[PDB]
Design a protein around this ligand. Structure first.
Ligand SMILES: Nc1ncnc2c1ncn2[C@@H]1O[C@H](COP(=O)(O)OP(=O)(O)NP(=O)(O)O)[C@@H](O)[C@H]1O
Ligand SMILES: Nc1ncnc2c1ncn2[C@@H]1O[C@H](COP(=O)(O)OP(=O)(O)NP(=O)(O)O)[C@@H](O)[C@H]1O
Ligand code: SF4
Ligand SMILES: [Mg+2]
Ligand SMILES: [Mg+2]
Ligand SMILES: [N+]
Ligand SMILES: [N+]
Ligand SMILES: [N+]
Ligand SMILES: [N+]
Ligand SMILES: [N+]
Lengths: 422, 243, 243, 421
């Protein structure tokens, strides 16, 4: 209420547009989450985060800045959270998920561009997002065309440091990325005034590793039959990983896993054992882009995994320890390069990841979902679908944007798929 | 006795199967109110043992068993053409290509992408605006079917405006629209494998020029149900009976 | 004796300025035949000393001096609002933002991108189809206007179908359509600089709900010509006089 | 008949190829042959178009019969110099035809750049004798659509993918030098011809001579009245990508000789009050003539093209070096001077635009980029804003390969010409 509103004032949030943006969220969350039965008790923490999504955490970040720490905003899992957190500064991922801000983003971006990019740009331009308002810096990356060229525009509103990611994973590329990581470490040191040493870099690695491990633990529990948790709840948790305090977040995820282990031990789940188990693959689904999971699970399926960067690509790979800073930096670089994003060529590891997940999670069908005008994942979906069909794995290709009201079109396609694979 | 209700984006259809296996059918415009259209169709229909509801409006209709139009279209067309494995359904908002097995069960399917939505309605609107007063066979032989953008109805409408603004014949534009649509639909209808023969159904199949252009582009026989509007509803009615 | 003829995608308009400076106007639907509409417009007019033709049909008409609707719209709006520097023209196919100087001369302009074509005609189509017989006061009084996709008329039609299929109120859908259109137009109207005041013209400016939603989104003063349909044709007639 | 036999040997789909080539002569008639005041030296290029799938395709086929290879490319960054050093041929095959877009869409998204869809469709349908005679494709990691399409195209023809960096700092320049060295080894392997100082200097000289001839033609367009319509220069720059470099350079220089005579007499193709237009943006591959034809059909004259079928192709020449290592370094440096929007930032391109506006005495800039080209589409915002700050009239256009949006484009172009007159 009042205390949040004063914080948003100090951050120069456009209060009226911000209220208009948030106004319909509680009803959606009530329909898609709170009114859905059989959710684990340990979801209460995450529900309360969503209920104060622009409150307590934004206060925490504001207070860190008053202590002399910094807030770095990121848009890609390749940016090394470990280096930022080693300094005591904060890393928040601000990938856009909201249609509200897309027209504002289109004042400086083409309308035939990925909505993730357009939405994030609109949040900054309209001063609608308290997290974007509290951020000191943006760390960008040379991934897709839209993001790469959008950074040049965004820099007029907030300083953007652009990391150059290579486009292959040969030895020359691995060495190139190692150097980009070292350059970024130096930029972080300069901006925070905190030198990286063996102690604080090891601690930053351990903190982010602990977060990834908790999400890996949650992902493994979804292999059980019946599914002990709906996929929409796990998507929410993976979305919130990008904003929350890493230590608190990991603790709350592990508390959920303890509850889910009790369900598994009694054979309790959220669906019948005959409900179709679905793997999602494609682009990240940033908060509050809940549509695809909601439609699948409202049609009686259960999503048991996400091969995306808000999902398995985020948490699968942990940093290997090393005794000195030089070795830790090389291992941080190596961790991120294990991420099999479609911006790399070839990206044959992603297909192998998909096929492995189909077996590990005992999946009945694969839904490949990518955002409209995402060319990296849109183009690659052809080879993915061709291999899955060769292996007789049911496959459905879906595309959409952040506009919520193409429900009927998506529902018919999803339900026809579930009917087919039943 | 067993009823199938197809509440489509443009038209609503009801098929009732009797105990003898006979069936009757009724079609009305949906008028963006599928609850009203469904109750109208069901008016005075007697005592129904089972009802299946399909199409866009199935989400709102408050009784009957819900089944998608993909599954129903496969079952209905199988009753008519058990020997043909591929079905192209062109409606007002969606296009559907379906491959079925020897029991009319769905083996694979694909529906139009977002930019390809609304082809049927666009043809209906543009024909109303410019094309009622033309012979069908004068389109098939028209020597200058103008190429029209295949991207979407926005781009096509833009080109139609420019074409008629510079004095292009209405008939040349209509033929171009049908030819370009048939070419896109031919590639679409091969998405699940190359058909040896194709069932073409839905309201879009009632445009005789479109069927002939589609057949020529595909190079295989294209068969059209005697009443392509109601084949999905028939499928729904057969599923109603089989459950 | 000075005539301006605007052969637009949807309607054709004729303005005639007498020697005294008074003027009359005529408006007829184009019906996809600009030449016929313009000839119907010019018959029984008396002899015209000078004619300027603008709009989609201007070349095909093959009469008078041809000037684009950007220049004509700037000239006609300047006669009515010499003190407002920005003009938003929403027609049936194209949307235009124009910046003019103190003398009425175009200093910059922008028209819709390809995916943004046809907004006005879509609104006309959907209103008749949905059925629009509530007053605008209902629309601005609507507390649950549904946000509709702002990409293009294809995606928006798909959502209108989904929304009505689910049982959403037609008033909530119509309100949402005007509101989203007003939001897109407001951002478009700031393309050449943020106006302190805006002229809103074209047939799009005849929708009362859209004018009000647009002014609220803009946050600045909006003025609308007495007859927004004809301001481009008036500009043509003023050019015809001056040359 | 000799052509038809060659196409059959290349496994062209003869019926579709005929269908594709059927409307072309009439369009060329309308937009080129029947246009008055064209230089006499256009006759050579008109003849090339007239037999676009004949003489040159024969020459390429005969090259392969002698054990040389044909490399197909889609970007100016691929080093023509190294391929030609070995006696093998380099041809640029960027797509410019709507006819093949649906075929490309069988394996590519419909919301993709039509250059990519059209090129893919040419190979899939077996429509293009140049694509059919090619031994290899040399792809590059530029835009997302091309980079990911190479993975699909490799199923039809072997694709070698060069990794271009995305910045131009020292680490990037070293990286690209190493890519050029790896590519050289690949050409040596496929051709069996080892590079030495002699044949690499010769390859450099050959391509430099082609670029220098196109630079000479570009410079002559600064004169008022314009001595040549821009549509004719676009065609020449398009043919530069698959004609023989020696013969092509000779015919371009012969054209320049004739244009010099026109300038010496103050003769031009337009009145000198006609608006002079600079196009900037994406390449316009053959036969994507629409935008030039509409501008010049409306009374303007295009006097330059800041595009890779245009100034970005020929502006930069390779500097000499004494040995093979130095020459490869200099070949890499030449290509990295190209200011493509796939680099960040791309401030050099804005400098090039501003310099061209002054030198060519330009009245207005038309930024034309193909639909769904995201590098140039996004960059257009900063370009337009800076030209605004410098009071240079600017019009952003986008389109695809379909022809019937001329009415929309005409109104935008003609309103722009009215505004800047
Ligand atoms: N005489 C005609 N009158 C109206 N529509 C016609 C006619 N002939 C063909 N059609 C086409 O029939 C289409 C409607 O077919 P229909 O199968 O009833 O669609 P639907 O099921 O209501 N919509 P959908 O939800 O996409 O399946 C229209 O869009 C027209 O293109
Ligand atoms: N009562 C109404 N009846 C019809 N159209 C209306 C009405 N009220 C508003 N309009 C709008 O007026 C638009 C047509 O405006 P108009 O300015 O005449 O377009 P135009 O000039 O013919 N076409 P354009 O070539 O794009 O400039 C329609 O598309 C509708 O959206
Ligand atoms: S206008 Fe056409 S191409 Fe553009 S987004 Fe809409 S459907 Fe797609
Ligand atoms: Mg239907
Ligand atoms: Mg108009
Ligand atoms: N519950
Ligand atoms: N390597
Ligand atoms: N078969
Ligand atoms: N082949
Ligand atoms: N550097």
């Amino acid at each position: 209420g009042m205390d949040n509103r004063e914080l948003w004032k100090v951050l120069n949030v456009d209060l009226e547009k911000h209220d208009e943006f948030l106004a319909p969220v509680p009803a959606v969350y009530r329909e898609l989450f709170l009114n859905r039965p059989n959710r684990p008790r340990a979801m209460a923490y995450f529900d309360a985060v969503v209920g104060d999504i622009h409150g307590i955490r934004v206060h925490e970040l504001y207070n860190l800045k008053q202590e002399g720490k910094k807030v770095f905003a990121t848009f890609c899992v390749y940016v090394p959270e470990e280096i930022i957190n080693a300094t005591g500064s904060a890393c928040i991922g601000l990938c856009g998920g909201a249609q509200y801000t897309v027209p504002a983003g289109e004042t400086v971006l083409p309308r035939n561009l990925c909505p993730l990019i357009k939405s994030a740009m609109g949040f900054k331009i309209e001063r609608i997002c308290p997290y974007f308002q509290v951020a000191d810096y943006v760390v960008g990356e040379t991934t897709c065309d839209g993001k790469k060229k959008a950074w040049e525009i965004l820099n007029e509103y907030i300083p953007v440091y652009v990391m150059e990611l290579p486009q292959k994973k040969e030895e020359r590329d691995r060495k190139f990325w190692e150097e980009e990581i070292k350059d970024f470490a130096q930029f972080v040191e300069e901006k925070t005034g905190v030198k990286l040493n063996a102690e604080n870099l090891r601690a930053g690695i351990e903190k982010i590793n602990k977060k990834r491990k908790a999400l890996k633990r949650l992902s493994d529990l979804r292999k059980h039959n019946p599914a002990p948790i709906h996929g929409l709840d796990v998507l929410l948790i993976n979305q919130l990983a990008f904003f929350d305090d890493p230590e608190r977040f990991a603790t709350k995820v592990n508390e959920l896993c303890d509850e889910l282990e009790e369900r598994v031990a009694k054979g309790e789940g959220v669906v019948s054992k005959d409900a179709p188990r679905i793997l999602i693959t494609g682009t990240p689904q940033p908060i509050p882009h809940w549509k695809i999971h909601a439609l699948i699970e409202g049609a009686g399926g259960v999503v048991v995994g996400e091969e995306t960067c808000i999902g398995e690509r985020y948490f699968k790979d942990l940093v290997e320890p090393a005794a000195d800073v030089e070795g830790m930096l090389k291992n941080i670089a190596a961790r991120s390069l294990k991420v099999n994003c479609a911006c790399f060529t070839p990206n044959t590891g992603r297909l192998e990841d998909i096929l492995s997940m189909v077996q590990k999670l005992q999946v009945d069908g694969v839904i490949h979902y990518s955002l409209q005008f995402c060319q990296p994942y849109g183009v690659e979906s052809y080879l993915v679908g061709r291999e899955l069909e060769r292996r007789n794995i049911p496959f459905l290709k879906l595309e959409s944007d952040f506009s919520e009201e193409d429900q009927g079109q998506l529902k018919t396609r999803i339900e026809a798929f579930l009917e087919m694979i039943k | 006795m067993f009823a199938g209700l197809d509440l489509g984006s443009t038209n609503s259809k009801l098929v009732i199967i009797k105990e003898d296996g006979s069936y009757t059918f009724k079609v009305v415009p949906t008028r963006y109110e599928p609850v009203k259209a469904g109750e109208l169709l069901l008016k005075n229909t007697g005592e129904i043992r089972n009802l299946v509801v399909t199409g866009y409006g199935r989400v709102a209709f408050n009784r009957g068993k819900v089944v998608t139009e993909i599954t129903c279209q496969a079952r209905g067309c199988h009753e008519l053409f058990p020997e043909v494995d591929y079905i192209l359904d062109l409606g007002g908002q969606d296009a559907k290509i379906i491959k079925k097995d020897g029991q009319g069960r769905v083996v694979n399917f694909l529906m139009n992408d977002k930019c390809a939505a609304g082809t049927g309605r666009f043809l209906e609107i543009i024909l109303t605006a410019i094309g009622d007063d033309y012979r069908d066979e004068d389109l098939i032989n028209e020597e200058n079917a103008v190429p029209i953008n295949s991207m979407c109805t926005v781009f096509a409408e833009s080109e139609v405006i420019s074409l008629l603004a510079r004095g292009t014949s209405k008939r040349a534009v209509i033929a171009g629209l049908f030819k370009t649509t048939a070419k896109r639909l031919a590639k679409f209808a091969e998405s699940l494998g190359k058909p040896r023969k194709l069932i073409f159904t839905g309201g879009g199949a009632k445009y005789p020029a479109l069927r002939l252009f589609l057949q020529k582009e595909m190079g295989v026989e294209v068969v059209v149900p005697p009443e392509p509007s109601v084949t999905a509803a028939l499928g729904a009615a057969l599923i109603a009976r089989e459950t």
